[PDB]
Design a protein around this ligand. Structure first.
Ligand SMILES: NC(=O)C1=CN([C@@H]2O[C@H](COP(=O)(O)OP(=O)(O)OC[C@H]3O[C@@H](n4cnc5c(N)ncnc54)[C@H](OP(=O)(O)O)[C@@H]3O)[C@@H](O)[C@H]2O)C=CC1
Lengths: 491, 492, 491, 490
């Protein structure tokens, strides 16, 4: 594959029209150090306008007003266009993020599935009828789109996270104002192209690109946005919350990442489990809200199992993201690169044993990190508690099932969890007693958009995808009708 | 003839199944009789750190959440049955601390019994999803589980009834509770703690920590070990709870806040039926109600006549002693709210709106009473048009077309409740669909049991209470994916 | 618009292969009297072969072990090939049935809608988990396809009823043996071609064409069919029930027709109502099971209303179905035509008062009948009680809402009913208290496949369409797991 | 304890007790002493009862009330059931022969059924479609079907009655009950309870008598809208014919089974053995859901077979009034003979008896001993046919797929059991064995929260849970258009 001759100039998208931009962020491949894109830096005026378009499009019934059939037509068309242009979107995703082309193309197939699921849930979205309240009273509960929804996506899965929110938000008849990561805006603008091509009315999907402190905060505080999906860090989630209270009490769907445990029992398929732990921390080079960063292993196989994980971690093919054979790609931002390398550092200083990795992968160009494992970890240590968002794995030992669930639940977070055992009783106890919203039993990062996803504790608020994720962006209306004459209260 | 107690009743607070005495005490006097009635314990943040501890042990020990929905349903159904037995007591204390008429107060208790039976029913029906349709290899599952320790903060306007519209739905899932009633209406909450204990609630599953919002309330909104908070009250304190949550442990919030609820009357409605419903809407609980009908929106052809029919109803309402079963509206619960409502009437006059009725106190020598009030010639900018007054003050708006009615009905930062009054299916259905309010009444007002959810759009808050939706608000959805057979390795 | 020069010779479809006929039913256009098709008359051996194909396809995992993603992918591509080939299915539907081409094309749009809905339901199909049963006991309710489903369709909506059943049945992973009506077999075989083109595995969808006395009855008694969808007459529905009892206790989806009421209040839009009444009884020339055959109008406006309906019925364009302006077309079978003319005869003979129509429309070629309205009908009269399946309207008068409901309920059936009132309390009273499974308030025959459909009383069993319809062809399994060691019953 | 004279009952129509003009004289199957006098009613008594249920449905005296009111009557009934638990246990043993310990454990599940039902009455809901356009609104209503017939068998007279009646009642339906002729008492005691709890007249009618007079009158009745029937596939088939031949009444059928219990070595073979013993011995094998086909892994089969033999040879048989008695009498001489006939045929077909095989001459009554046959071929009579006695047949297997084929080698699909600690095997069996009531490392567990019912020839529809309450509701689709309509003719 060739890298671009010249960087690709992009516009931003508002009320159906693409605009040129007056200031531009030049993004380079973090894998190649060569310019690839020019994304417009939008203003608060650019954002107020996007929100104004989204409101017009909602109120004038051009989208919420249609039969669900017509919202489903657009999402099915989009899903179809997505498949047609998969190789395009994978190409651009890799260029801005650094992920392997194989991983990228896998994610595009999941997006297609997301759109098709949303198209289905557009028609299935329902409330209740209560015909059982008596001859006088009729109850019913309606669902309706909340209105103008702002979506803020991070740079880990720019296109897949975008596609795990946008189609579910639209299916109910909501309008969208999206602000992608500045470093990964291109695949989000390509979705704009696709949705326009698939016949999405003007104003319904608007992309305002730029920084979180200009456009992001202008959205988190905006007085006319009804609800915000934000996916990212617990810190910036907490900013969104303050902004909500301080503005218009807008609803918040928060997906905020975590310190996710993977519990391994001696009576598991140790080989398969070791493969899953390696994938679970190396996948997207460990730049993952749902990565399995804490290993919780039965002591009887702890030392063995750790070294099985090393065996898998050192076999991982690191290289050019464009090589179909490459398994893990580049660290997306220099900021995240220094954080990760600084955490491994501290870990070695806090008193932990480096069993493997701990260093960069020298390619001359780009930023790469070795899959890393740490043992002899105290729950005090920084690498035991803090989300590192790199391919660094801490190991912890347990004697009894109660101990494993306690070490797994010793977090402020609660996004994902994993349990590896052949014992139905152990699998169900850990599954039912570890406070996490996304669980895998003898599997890793499976599940389509059929099912919801989200976090316990500090890993956020609400659930995305499935019929539950369509529903999050609808408002519940209770309606009581009295039939016949009413007994007057007064005299 | 009802008699007030000879000496104020000194209560305790309830932590880990044990009842506590109190060190410092708040002295409450009837809002309607101006007579000492209760002595509630002023609690501490340490008393609260301990209540949350009682509830964490109760949730972590499996004494309620490891029990079966049937053993939790048994307690709730027992609780409903103890409420039927004690209806008269709860009525008495609620009246003493609130000012409500006794008749209303007894009505509210029957809704509270319905609520507990709904919670007992939901406890068994609480369910997630199976996905047997994902392939030979993959099996999908969505669990629900109790979120854990729930902080509950109730207001003073429906002290016992709003408590019974939260506590039992929270308890059904296997959540543990820590409750703060309002300090002016703390007694009937501690009576509920009595009922739940006699009904066989395990220790620690229900704690009641009485005191102020500035001390205990805040300590709860920022508590590091409370998993969810249910707040009912004002949008302003709701924003406080949101901030508190972000600065503490990113706890979930059930917020049920204020309203400026419209009631749309069309000319083709039953004017006399609608007039009665409007006066009730705004006068019930002396307009001290988040779901009150505080904005009349009436069709020009019948607007002035209807305004005058509503004032004739308003002025026929029997005001007096809340213990007289003939009394229809009661006292204003707090001096603050009294002063706020008289200030708003004052503003209403100042800003150019015309009083048609009311606009001052009702003198009984003892108590704080306000006369039902209607303003007309109200412009949408006016304070009385926009601000929640939380008294019996109604602002009337005139409209020509259905589109205008709905424009005015939506013309608020809020969206808790709404009413539409028409016999035309097309209008009722239009206004029901296009007005952004989470609780709607077609040719009725404040009807519907706990079968259905309730809650707000916009600034009237987050989440829904009651029905199955209510039980589920305090649960966490857990996705489970199981792979059966040998896995295809990622790494050769 | 050209008629076929020679009749088009089909084969049947078994285990993904087209099979030639040995013997053939020759069908001529019910409206042109020109040969149009030659369809294979199959045997019980051909039926047995198709069932064994459908059985091997369900137990091999070629469709039912597949993921809901894969099934949805075939159903969505099918819907896509259906819109692509819309005009070709219409052409052949019209040639065999008599439908106006305009109505034909509209029925195709609904078929597409049906396919998209089933595709969405393929993924949404779910059971229930019970986490609340205690720390010892975990409960769980699974749905799974029932297995080999027999589908038997009538000639009135050959393709539309097919598409309102087949895709819903397929969505769960059930396999099909289809037997359409011999007079209208062509569009069912064109769906077999379509399904195959869209990537449906072999054995999932077989069509065995032939008579009810041979293949139909062979299906109703088949010892390896798990469930049977029959649409048609109460009489054959009852046959099917007897067969299931004498066979393998297969579940039955029965859609068996009715004498449906349309309730017209004076406070209604009488103009809109009159149009609706004309449509309800004239649409598909009254050969609809959801046909408004019983007008129940308020006495205060009955005479005025009756005249309006008559004004509507005479303005109805009857003629060659391929003229895009014809609004009603030919009677499908000479049997039904004799039944309709006999019922109009009987009607007149029993003292009923003919207001309009009441005889054939002579075009020299074809079989056509006039929109026909009787007044002065007593509930004892034959036209009042018996299903005519022609464009014949009986008018009843009422004075009270009670009398309207009492009349509307005065039948053994309960498939459809309509109410026409601007009064919310009257429309609600009639809706809640009239025993009909398919209701229309100030409309007639609205509603895509989002919602279930089916009958009360003697109009049949079970529901079709919506997520409820997909679930009708699944079996509910309850699973209880106890975790830990158990309390022995024997010490 | 000893009954001095038979207790002569009445039947219950339109809230009144009517007197029997002819009677069935039941004797305790365990004591051979006259215990009860059940009125044998006429087909005009049945028509009279259906007319009452119909009246009570149509006058909105029950269906018309708020769910809150239906729930009250049901919760009150649950109350009176707990406070009368002993009375009903007494009469339940007297007519059935079941151990008093087991009888009381049932009344506890019956109370569970009543409370669930009361919850379901309030939570019963359909759907709103607000997603169809500015002009189109869509809505799905559920309503009580109307007058339901309920026929109960004699194995669990009161528990199966309570596993149908409260769920049928919760939606707004009225009922016409015919308990089993040998076991009508506890059903008549339920009628007394529902009345005292404030259930209107006509909502719950009991017409006692024969299946040939009253039952068949019901399955054919032109004004019964639906029939729950629990029992045999053949009387189910008779009900199907009768429905077709009459008015097309819907049918909630819960029929019989040959339910396999699969035991792997990966299991707690000791916890399984106790469960297999139970599975087959509970109610002296007089269960539609009894584990009657042991499916065990060859490698541990002979060991396990023995471990179960030991468990069966230890079960305490005797006076059902002894609270230490673990299995009781055979309810009918008809069944007793069928069971011995089947043990007899089993020896004859070349199957090996490891234990049981004959009656238990406990002084009086009909008591049969827990019986285990091994070296059973699928062709054998005892392999295929439902025995409804404590007779277990043992099969051996090497593979999981092998195990699943034997379990699915039946015309039935009511119950199944899997005993394994391997999640993969438990999950495969559960997913691939066509049975509607599943138990993984447990047996006959499950409360009213979960629906129950059969695959294949074990019946139609589901009972219990919210799904079970909904089976007796009818789905109405409502589409409303708003504003002026595009006219079809100019
Ligand atoms: N009782 C009612 O509801 C009445 C119904 N009608 C309407 O008249 C129309 C014509 O009915 P009619 O032609 O008599 O029959 P049906 O429409 O009921 O038969 C429909 C289908 O069943 C097949 N079939 C025939 N015999 C059997 C059998 N023994 N077992 C299973 N399937 C069988 C037919 O095959 P084949 O092609 O060989 O016929 C056909 O494909 C129906 O659409 C019905 O709605 C009108 C009067 C009364």
């Amino acid at each position: 594959v060739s890298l671009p001759l010249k960087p690709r100039e992009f516009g931003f998208f508002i009320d159906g029209e693409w605009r040129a931009g007056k200031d531009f962020f030049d993004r380079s491949s973090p894998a190649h150090d060569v310019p690839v894109t020019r994304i417009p830096r939008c203003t608060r005026e650019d954002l107020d306008e996007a929100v104004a378009a989204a409101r017009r499009a909602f109120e004038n019934g051009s989208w919420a007003g249609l039969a669900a059939a017509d919202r489903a037509a657009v999402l099915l068309k989009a899903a179809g266009l997505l498949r047609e242009r998969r190789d395009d979107i994978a190409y651009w995703e890799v260029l801005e993020n650094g992920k392997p082309i194989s991983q990228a193309k896998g994610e595009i197939d999941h997006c297609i599935a997301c759109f098709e699921m949303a198209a289905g849930a557009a028609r299935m979205l329902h409330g209740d009828t209560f015909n059982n309240l008596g001859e006088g009273l009729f109850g019913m509960v309606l669902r309706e789109p909340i209105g103008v929804v702002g979506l803020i996506t991070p740079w880990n899965f720019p296109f897949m996270i975008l596609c795990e929110r946008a189609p579910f938000i639209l299916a109910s008849g909501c309008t969208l104002v999206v602000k992608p990561a500045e470093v990964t805006s291109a695949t989000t603008l390509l979705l704009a192209e696709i949705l326009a091509d698939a016949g999405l009315p003007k104003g319904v999907f608007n992309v305002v690109t730029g920084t979180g402190r200009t456009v992001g905060q202008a959205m988190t505080e905006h007085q006319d946005i009804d609800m915000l999906s934000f996916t990212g860090s617990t810190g910036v989630g907490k900013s969104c919350i303050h902004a909500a209270a301080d503005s218009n009490l807008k609803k918040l769907g928060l997906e905020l990442g975590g310190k996710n445990p993977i519990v391994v029992f001696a009576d598991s398929n140790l080989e398969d489990a070791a493969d899953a732990v390696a994938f679970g921390i190396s996948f997207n080079t460990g730049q993952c809200c749902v990565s399995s960063s804490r290993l919780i292993v039965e002591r009887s196989v702890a030392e063995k199992f750790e070294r099985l994980v090393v065996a898998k971690m050192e076999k991982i093919r690191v290289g050019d993201p464009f090589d179909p054979e490459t398994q893990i790609g580049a660290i997306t931002t220099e900021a995240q690169n220094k954080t990760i390398l600084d955490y491994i550092a501290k870990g070695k200083a806090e008193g932990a044993k480096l069993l493997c990795g701990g260093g960069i992968v020298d390619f001359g160009k780009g930023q790469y990190i070795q899959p890393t494992l740490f043992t002899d970890v105290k729950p005090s240590m920084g690498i035991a508690r803090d989300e590192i968002f790199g391919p660094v794995l801490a190991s912890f030992h347990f004697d009894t099932v109660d101990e494993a669930i306690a070490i797994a639940n010793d977090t402020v977070y609660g996004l994902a969890a994993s349990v590896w055992s052949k014992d139905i009783d152990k699998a169900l106890a850990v599954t039912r007693r570890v406070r996490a919203g996304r669980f895998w039993v003898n599997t890793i990062m499976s599940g389509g958009p059929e099912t919801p996803l989200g976090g316990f504790k500090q890993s956020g608020w609400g659930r995305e995808a499935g019929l539950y994720g369509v529903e999050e962006y609808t408002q519940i209306k209770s309606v009581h009708i009295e039939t016949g004459k009413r007994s007057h209260w007064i005299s």
